[PDB]
């Protein structure tokens, strides 16, 4: 409602997507780093993508 029709959903969905991307990778890496498992972010970002 703050932004218009062509950008209320454009960047609004992007904010949800971008925030979820960094959140999802952190939570997944949190499990593996805690257990002493080293996995590059590439293998996780592909799944999150």
């Amino acid at each position: 409602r703050i932004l218009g029709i062509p950008w209320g959903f454009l960047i609004g969905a992007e904010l949800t997507i971008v925030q979820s991307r960094i959140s999802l990778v952190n939570k997944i890496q949190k499990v593996y780093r805690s257990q002493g498992v080293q996995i590059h972010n590439r293998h996780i970002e592909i799944i999150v993508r």
């Binding site: 703050i2 932004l3 218009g4 029709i5 062509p6 950008w7 960047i11």
Partner: peptide, 27 residues
């Protein structure tokens, strides 16, 4: 769905006005 100061005249729609939405995005 219908079968006075008429203040509706000042309700300005900015559909398609890219410059207007950029200002609100900035602040």
């Amino acid at each position: 769905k219908g079968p006075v100061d008429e203040l509706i005249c000042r309700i300005k729609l900015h559909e398609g006005d890219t410059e207007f939405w950029k200002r609100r995005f900035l602040g």
